Structures are given as structure tokens and as C-alpha cells.
Amino acid sequence: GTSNRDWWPNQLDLSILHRHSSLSDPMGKDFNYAQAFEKLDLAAVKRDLHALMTTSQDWWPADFGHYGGLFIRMAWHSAGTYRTADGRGGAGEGQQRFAPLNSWPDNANLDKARRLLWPIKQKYGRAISWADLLILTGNVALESMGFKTFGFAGGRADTWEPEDVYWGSEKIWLELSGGPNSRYSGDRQLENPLAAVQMGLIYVNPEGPDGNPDPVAAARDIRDTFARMAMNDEETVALIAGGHTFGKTHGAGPASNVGAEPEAAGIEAQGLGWKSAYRTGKGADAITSGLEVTWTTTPTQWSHNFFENLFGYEWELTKSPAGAHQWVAKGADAVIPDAFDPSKKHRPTMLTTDLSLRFDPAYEKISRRFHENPEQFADAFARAWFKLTHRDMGPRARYLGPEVPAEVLLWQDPIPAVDHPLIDAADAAELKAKVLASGLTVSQLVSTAWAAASTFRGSDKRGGANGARIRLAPQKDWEANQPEQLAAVLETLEAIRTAFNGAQRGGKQVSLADLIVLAGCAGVEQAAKNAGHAVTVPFAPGRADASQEQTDVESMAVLEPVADGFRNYLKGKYRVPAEVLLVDKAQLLTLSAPEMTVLLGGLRVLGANVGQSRHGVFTAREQALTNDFFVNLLDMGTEWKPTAADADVFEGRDRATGELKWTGTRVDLVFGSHSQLRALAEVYGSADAQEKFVRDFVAVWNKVMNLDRFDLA
Amino acid sequence: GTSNRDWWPNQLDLSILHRHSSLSDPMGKDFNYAQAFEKLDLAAVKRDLHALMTTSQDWWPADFGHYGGLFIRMAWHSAGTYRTADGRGGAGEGQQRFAPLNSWPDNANLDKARRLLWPIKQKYGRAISWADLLILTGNVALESMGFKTFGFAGGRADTWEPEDVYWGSEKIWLELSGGPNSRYSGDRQLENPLAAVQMGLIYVNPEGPDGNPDPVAAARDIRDTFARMAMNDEETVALIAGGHTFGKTHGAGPASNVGAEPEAAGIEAQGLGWKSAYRTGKGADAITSGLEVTWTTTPTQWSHNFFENLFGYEWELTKSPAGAHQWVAKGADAVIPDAFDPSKKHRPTMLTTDLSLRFDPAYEKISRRFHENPEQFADAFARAWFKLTHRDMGPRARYLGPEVPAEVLLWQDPIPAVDHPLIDAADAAELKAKVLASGLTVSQLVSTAWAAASTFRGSDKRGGANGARIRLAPQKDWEANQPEQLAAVLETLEAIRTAFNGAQRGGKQVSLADLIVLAGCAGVEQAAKNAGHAVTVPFAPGRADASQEQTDVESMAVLEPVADGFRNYLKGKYRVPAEVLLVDKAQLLTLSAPEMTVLLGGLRVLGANVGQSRHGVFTAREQALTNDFFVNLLDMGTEWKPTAADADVFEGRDRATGELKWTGTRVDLVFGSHSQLRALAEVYGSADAQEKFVRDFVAVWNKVMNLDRFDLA
Ligand code: HEM
Ligand code: HEM
Ligand code: NA
């Protein structure tokens, strides 16, 4: 059946803004997962998981009689899709059970692991999400095998359809670099936002870069991908060595024996895949990655044997029974146990990427320190495992259950607890009046509050106005935030604040984070007044101000908007068209297409554009909240053409006289071009729609200002 | 960006069940279009349309100074996508403004027509939908030019995204038949459900079949395509001759001058397409179809000149300035006015498909009668134009405004007015008890009510239980409805009804249509009781019984279910996998994926299968409403394999003993295979889900029962 995407494959796709509707969700409108979780008997679930570990099923027998390694890999792959560039991927929505991730080659046989968990899922039902269960299971596996975990939080609500993620443009699974859709260019530069070296991999190729078994070159890819998953060298070394203290790989026979991945398998497979024709197809004859490596002498127990073996032998290049490159310890005895036959033993083996930890100079220093100080290795791994598995969960206020670690960690972008009375509605009215009497303009107040709040992204729940991080490095210096203008607004707000706080009793004070948002509200109210409407903008206090020392400057860099269509901003020239980037940003803001449309039209007339650009400012009453943007955009008396100087700026001229009326970008004009967007613009550009426009704007403005308010959730 | 559709292009697509969410809709959750339209000043809108007809815009000059012909073609293409096979297409959702229809080659320059209407759309706002306005504008055009229409109903609510319609498998616009994705096979048999001869056409090729200018062969394509749009020979002749009494075609220069369709055009085109480099690109130099024909001597006035010309001349094969085949009157004078230059006249011209009306013997008889009796022609066209433009509106209860015709038309599947008091809640309870005391079983009651209600399709709002047409020809004889079983059920219910109705006072009575539905409600209640649950199934009275004389048997044929997954039924062997046909039927029922899943699982265990098939009946407590289908489907202790006898039937065997536990079809097992459906099945197969399953089942059963109840809307 030929579809619109077949006819017009470069058209903008808005269905990404309308996923996760109440239509696809089997739970009721009122279902609140946090409340269900809070009543789960988590101790009972963990006992069930501990029993499961050694309860081997004949359709996928447990290696060494313990599924711990398999479930550790399962949880690490659940988390390990995360990219810091956009915050997409990660464990937080349980997307490993949906396409495409359930059929990625790197997730081979994790279908078996998740099926092993069905009876537990079934027993506890809606009280534990698949998303939480996958992580909990990894935790239990580590505990079962003697490793003390740092903690666990629940609260990952399940999702019900695949997330729309750009995973790359290749049309061949695991395509090596340099093809027609190469994710690499230049000196091995991986394109943003990708965080894996090949389509269908988690991070790197375990045989080495593009299958070449050079551990030093492998280390470069490990460092680059793990940095794109928010992990530094010490965390990387701790995670890889920690993970490969357990379990084994599976490569018993040639990969040609392995059949269709789950999404391609026949209906009788009932959701499973990779059925193998090699011998019994399972257990001792399992084929997963095609490598055949068992790292330690006790694969089902925490040990310090990984680094003993890594440093204690010299390594020789060999091949697995499937033909894959791997390494074997020279001159070693057969000390590694077999997973099924107690009469066989094996020599120590390693992956190329394991050897990276020794042959890369910076990793070697870490690896040695962990070898000599195994308590440091244990603590580093426990911490890094928690980070890995919770990195996308958002602020600590979302963490549920009795195992949440008390320690506050820098990467969580912590917010101080509020320990004073909040402002009330009378105080909010007094502060808004003070803000309006200071001389700050609608444009300044709007633009500052937009800049503070619009860092939020729903993919990993980082960012937003809570914390007043807009006054700190690096947000205060971002070009999209207009550093000089920002500094002058903040200085005026801080004087208002000081004056209001010095006048209070009983400990009441207002945070700068609250005041920035409140001042934006006053701006919107003033702009509505300028247009003749009486509008009160809702405001919820309770944000607190974070310190510079609570704000990791390097981790904040990924929030910098290099494209923000809502301020008609683009930091440079990109291969992705600006309207694509607009819809991307709207998705991260959690906006639907009607919300994105109203918001953008209102911001243009309020003076939110960076640099006070006139592009899209289709009104003669700037700083008044009207639907002018729509009404003028849709006026057929204007003809549009790209300028000779810049094909991405357009001039709109009177059709009869040729006189120039307006200029716009691609972000502006898409609303007059895309047939779905223009249908939305028509609703707000109609003669009956000025009130609806103002009210819908206020609603969406409020929504954006509250995106990170999980303290009130 | 590579997507799941690229990796697994044959996987079932569930996103079609989750369109039209509240996310994509810019109107409030409470917006009621009928209530907005009922307050529209329709006479004021018509006066504005009437003015527009002769107010030429210089960006698309009006032919002959009058846009009537353009807007008639616009409204006929809005309506003319309709197919009776599925009820999809038609004018009822305003889909011409979205992809792909806005960019079909047969809709070239209708973008200009829609844009001419923006000022009126903007003036009246939400009180008149684009969908209604398109039709209304066609009516006003006809009226302005002296033609008396049969009437107009409003009520077509606007939609906000493209509908998912199968329009054929061709990858090339207008591909001639016989390619790799040919819509034809055998002796020019057009595949169901298609109703056009080439991808991107409304009905037929105006040059003749695959471009071959033979009027006799073209007539075969006209008759076949129009029959597939519910029009017979008399309606067909009346529509084509009627339409081509007005306006002209546009073919002033070579087609290579015409640029990209709207979905492919540049952003600066602002939603318009087919920009032409031929001379001024518009008006006298317009190019649309490539043909250059003007049919009558008064293209802006109703007349009987189409037939005077058709029969009063002999015709010669010629070519337009773009090279298209067309016909010119031999020996004639220059009697046809030019559209822009009052000093030029032209000879009469016709399309090959116009000449079909003369050279096909059955059409010729009708055409002669219309030529000799033009009052019969005007009446037939009026009626056909109303039918065409309202065929997908549904029951008369949905028709709004002051111009609705009072005559009841057989194609409307009319339902008699109710003229007595309805049953109340106590009467409903007495009837339910009487039904259950008769000895009708849960299976019989459920199967009967499902059969009556599940003929509804949301595409054209035909079918449903209102009418009690299940007791009439042809429904009572459809094989899916189990004619002998059905007759015995109906006979018992009619005795119950007679007894109840003979006992009442004050005119109260119950219709058989209501009692069929009620009896199904008693069945579901009893099945819930059988399982330990006390529930009340909601029921709303007020259906009425239609007569055989009010039921067009031939038009009802297209409602027959040849595939009904909800009853595990497939009438024969098809190219489309059964699971695809299930999701197709769910879409026509207006069901989401969660609703589909609950409904199917419940119907299995209630005994709804045709023939009492045991396929998918995964329970040992048949006729009890439990979640057994899901619990047993998801049990990993059962292994599934296709049977040697039939690859589409599967045996489920105990994995350990090999004992046969169940059988199922592809429809059954898709819920254990497809990763999104199996995530839904898991929620209903969990241990905490039996109350949820009962409640959600009752809700979706009630939704189905009420699909055609637009009297209560
Ligand atoms: C450079 C990074 C890494 C690479 C290239 C990599 C590669 C792989 C490969 C190829 C397998 C074998 C799959 C099979 O054939 O069954 C595997 C197994 C596994 N990995 Fe990793 N790994 C990486 C990092 C991780 C990390 C960060 C963890 C966890 C903290 C982890 C834990 C595991 C465990 C537990 C197994 C054993 C599976 C079992 O016993 O069934 N690895 N690794
Ligand atoms: C066999 C069925 C039909 C065929 C092949 C057909 C073909 C076409 C073609 C090729 C054009 C010229 C488009 C252009 O170049 O501007 C057109 C114009 C038109 N058609 Fe049809 N037609 C059919 C039936 C209908 C029907 C059923 C109606 C309405 C009741 C309709 C009303 C018109 C009108 C009013 C125009 C003139 C548009 C203008 O003045 O701009 N036609 N037809
Ligand atoms: Na994420």
C-alpha cells in the first residue's frame, strides 16, 4: 500500500508529536503509576527475582545454572541506548520490548531474558512496570552474585508504542562506516545525536572499529560513545570491567545458523526470534554475538578476576567458532569453567574492547588502580551502575520506593529543598506589579522566562526553570540566551527580589527561579492587556535556586539550544532543515502540533526572537498578545520568495504592488506550507479566534513553565 | 532516518487505530461542531459565496469571469474519492485539503479553488467546516448559474490529519495498468476496494483506458468505477453531462511546463502547487489536465447544450496543445466562447469519456431521453449531485440546517421515526430476565447482537443495529451470520417482544432492533455472572425497525463481512493476511488497539465464533466473561506450530509432554506475536486484571452497540 511517506519522503512528520495519546494506552485516563508502585511489595518481587535466577527453563537453559549474567546484560542494554545529545533512549520507558530495539542485533536473545520475566510481571501486574522490572532484575542479579548495589528507584511508567528516535540513516543492519549513509565523516567524527558506531549496536563493535581488532583504536570509539552516554573514563572502565566480571558471550557455531530477529519472525514464534539451527539452538550451543569469551574463573560470583586476567597474561589474536575476532591468554592453563559440562575447562579469553582497558594509556592507569585497589573498583562500579540505570529518570522527586540512595549526586542536577514559607497569591500580585513598574519590557520578561523554562526535555526530564540555572555558567553565556540582555534583566529581578525578601517576616522569601517565571507571567499579562484582554496567568511557586557547584557545566552543554524555532534561532547551518528541528524541539517540550503552533505564533508577536530579528514578526503591534502572526501569514495578498543572498530567508511582497511587507525564515513559513500545520494556523487566524488564541497561548505558556515541576506531581 | 516501516515493511500497522486523538485536534475537548453550525447564518455564507463567484483574483483569473465551473469540479472531486467497498473516501471529512489527495494529479489546481475560499472560511470560522464549505460552494456555484439544487445538509466536522486509506500499490503517479503493482488482473477486473483506474485519478482516464481514445471501451471503465462509487447508469450519465454543462478544461501548453504538486513544492509556494512556466502560468495560459475542451456555448449558465452538441455533431480525434487526445466537432462553426478574449470563438469539443455517453448503447438510450426531455435531466442531476455529495454522511439524523431535503431516499438506509414511549430501566430489566428465561444461551445472544451491530463502519457511517436489518434480506442470509441459527434466535426474541408489547399501556412498545441489542446485553451480563461479577451493561433504547421496502438489497451487499476477526471468520482465501483484515475492521468500527484487544479476547470466550469453531477459544469456562484468552495465550508452557493441513491454523501443545491444548488462527496468535499487541495482551493477562478486563469489555461492547446512534449524539 503506497503511503504519504513513500510519495513525499522528505515531508515533515508531525505524527511524532501525537504519540502516546490516550488512544494507544490500555490504562485508564486516571491511572497513576507512582501510586501503584508505592503499594507494590518490592521485597516480595525481589525474592521472586532471586528465585528466578537459578530456575533454568529448558527452552533457554541458564549458563552455569544462573541467569545473572544474561539479566545484567539485559538491564545494561536497556539503559545503554541513552544519548546525552537529545536525552533520547535509556531504560526509562521500557522501549527494549518494542521495535526496533527488541530486534536490534545487539539485543539478540534478550527476548529470552524478557520472556523469563513474564511470570513475575504477570503476578504483580500494573504495580511494577516492565521498565522498572528490567532494571530491578539487573540489580537483583548483581546482588544474587555477591555485589552490593548503590540503590534503586522505581517510577519508570510503561509506554505502549515505539518512541520516534533517529537511530541513524543506514538501510543495512550493522553497516560498516563509509557507506552511502555513513554516520562517520572526517577524522572518525560520529554524527550528532548518535551514540553508537554501527546501526543496531549499543556502543561499539566488540571485534574493534569496523571489525578491525586493534584495542587502541577500539578505545577511541569506547571513549567517544561512552562520553556521548554521559560517562567519563573512570565510569567507563568501572562499567566494562564490572559487567565482564560476570557471565559469558555466545558464539558456538556459525552465525548463518541464526534466523530471523523477532520483528521478522513467524507468528508461531510468539514474539521471540534468532531461532538457531546449530545443534540444539540453545544453552551449550547458543549463538548470540558470535564471540565465545568467558572472562573469569567464577562467572556467577563477584570477584577481582577480570583485572587479574587482563594484566596477568599476554594475549593472542584468535577466532571464535563463528569466525569472530577475540583474544586468548598465551600459555595459560584451562582455568575457566564451562557453562554446561563440568569435565571441560577453558583458557582465559577477552574481547578487543576488553583489551582497550589495558592498551589505551589513560584507561590503563585507571585499570591498574582498580586492580591494586579493588574496593575502589567496587565502589566506582556500584555508582556507575546506578548512574547508567537512572540517568534518564529526571529529578530526584520522581524516584520512588524504599531503596532510593540518600546521597545527592552531581549528575542528577540537584535542586535544594525548600525550607521556608512560599509566596501566596497576594505576594505574587505585589511582585508582578513591581516587575511591571521596573521598566522591564514584555519582550525582555517573555524572552527571559522562555529561555529559563525551555531547556526542559521530556526524553530524560533534564532542564527547565527550576534551579535558576539560567543565572549560572554555562546557561548565562549561551548565545541563544542573549547574554548581555539576560544579565540586565537578571540584575533588575535580583534587586526586586532583595527588596521583597528584606521586607518579609517569618522566614518567607522568593527564589530567583520563581521570580523569573513570575516575571514572565507578568509579561504575558501585560501583553494581553496591550491587546485589550483581561487575562490572569497562573503561577505556581516552589522552585529553588541551585548553586554553581550543583551545576556540572560540561553536562549542561548538551542542553544548549543550537536550534530554537520558537525564538527563530539557528546557531549555524545544519543538514537538517530548520522546520525539522522545530518539530524536534516541540517533541522534547512535550508539545502537540496545535500547542506548538499557538506558542510559536504568540512568541513571535511578543518579541521573543533572538537579536530582535524581524523575521516572522508579522504584526504592527509588537508586544501585544494577538493572533496577528496567523492572520498575516495566511493573507493571500502576499507572495513569498527566497532571497538571492540566503535561500533560507524569504521575502513576502504585496502581490499587486510588489512592495515588501515581511520577511520570514523556513520556521515561520512552514505554518503556511505544510498542509497539517496550515490547517492549524487557519483555526487561530480566523475572525472568531482572537479569544481562543489568547487563552490557548496562556495554557501552553503555563504548561512550559511547569514542565519540570515534579515536586507538585 | 531509517524507521520501523523500512526495516519490517510487512509488519502490521496499528498507528491507523490511533489517529484523530485529542492531541492533534486544535478545538477544545468540548467543541461540538453541530452546535456551531446550527448557529451559522447559512444565508449570509451563501451570499458571500455568490459574490465570490464573479470576483476574479489576479493570481488565478476566473474563466469567463465566473469561478462556478472550477468550484463544481472541486466539490465533485471532494466527493468523488468515495468507494462503496469500504465506505472510505468521500467529502465527509474534508480530506481534499490533506495529503495525498491535495496533491493527486486529478486534483491539480483545486489548490487554487480552496485558497479562493479562505476569506469566507476565515470570516465564519469554526461555525462552517472546510468539509461542509467545499460542498456548499459547489451548490452555490450551480445556483448562481441557474440550476436548482435538491438541497444541502451541513454537519461534516473537520478532521486534522490525513486518513489512512489504501489507494493502490503503484509507486508511480498515474501508472498505466499491467505494471508490477497493477490494480487490474484477469479480464480488466479492478481489485477491491479500489474505485479508480489509475493511481491519482478520481474515476477514469479522460483520454480513454490507459490513454487509448476509444469511447466504447472508456464506457466500460466509467460504468465499473461509478458502480464502485454507488452510482447506476442513469445517475452516471446525469452527473457527467450535468458537470460538463459548465466551465472548461485547461491544456494551453505542454505539460512539461508544470512544476511540483503541493506536497513537493517549495516552502515559498505556501501550500499551492503545479506552478506553470507556460506564459503567464494562469488564466488564458492555464494548464491543469492537459486537455483543452469547452463543452457548451454558455459555460457559466445551466442549459441543455451538452447533449445538443453531443448528438448534433460528428466528432473527430485531435490533440490539445499539450498533446492529449480529445475530440472536435466536424464541420462546425466557431460557436463556443473563449474564456478571456471576447473577440475569439471556438468549435465544440469533447472528451473521449463524454462520447461514451453517446457510443455505449445503454448510455445512449439514457442520454437520448435526457436530450429530448431536459427537465428529466435536470431532476436526475439534482438528485445525483445530492447523493454524491451526501453519500458518506450517514443517517439523516446527522443532517443539519435549513436546506435538508424532506424526501427520504432509499440509499440513505432510512429508519422510521419513533412515535411511542420508550422502555425504561425497569422494563429493560424485565426484558433481560425474560430473554435469559427463554433458554437462549450466552453464545447465541452475544453472537446475534454482534452480528447486528458490527455492520457499522465509520468511514461512511452506514450499518449498525438500528433498523433491525439483520432480520431482512440480505443480512439474514449472510454466511457469517449463521442463517439457520439466526432465524431460530430471532423467532424466540420476536415471541418475547410480542408478549411484552401486548401487555403494555399507553402506547409503550419495544422495537425488535432494541430488543436484539438488549438481549446481547443480557448475554454479556449473564457471562459476567457466570464468572462471579455483578455488572450492569448499559443500554439505550430508541432504535426502530426498518422494512424490507426501505432496504436496498444490492447496496447492502457491500456491508457483508467477508473477514471478521472478531468471530474468527474468513469467507475465503485472500491475498491480505487475516491480521491485516482484523485491524481494518477495527478501524471501521472506530476501535483503538486496546479496545480491539479486549473485545476480541472477550468474544472468544463468550462463544462468538462462527460455526462454534474452537480456534482461539482458550478457556475451559466457555460462556463466562473472564480474561482466560490472554492468560492462556501468553503461557510460555505452550508451544505453537502451523498444521500440515493448513499453514494458517496453529496447534498449541504443552512444551514438556506434547499434549494438544488448543488451536488458533493467525487472528488469535497475532496477539502473542506482534510486539504492541502482546504488550496490550499482557495488561489483560495479568493477575490483577480480571475486574479491569470485565469493565473494559462492557465499555467497548456498549460502544459497538451504540456506533450508529446519532439520534442520541
Ligand atoms: C565496550 C563496551 C562493551 C562491549 C563491546 C560489550 C560487548 C559484549 C558482548 C559482545 C557480549 C556477548 C553477547 C553474547 O554473545 O551473549 C557481552 C556480554 C555481557 N556484557 Fe558486555 N560489552 C560492553 C559493555 C558492557 C557493560 C557496560 C556491561 C554492564 C555493566 C556489560 C555486561 C555484560 C554482561 C554481564 C554480559 C554477559 C552476558 C551473559 O552472561 O549472557 N558489558 N558484552
Ligand atoms: C467520466 C467521468 C469524468 C471525467 C473523466 C472527467 C474529466 C474531467 C477533466 C479531465 C476535466 C478538466 C480538468 C482541467 O483541465 O481543468 C474536468 C473538468 C470538469 N469536470 Fe469533469 N469529468 C468527469 C465527471 C465529472 C462529474 C461527475 C462532474 C460533476 C458533476 C464534473 C464536473 C466538471 C466541471 C465543472 C469541470 C470544469 C472545471 C473548470 O471549469 O475549471 N465532471 N473533467
Ligand atoms: Na530518554
Ligand code: NA
Ligand atoms: Na468515507
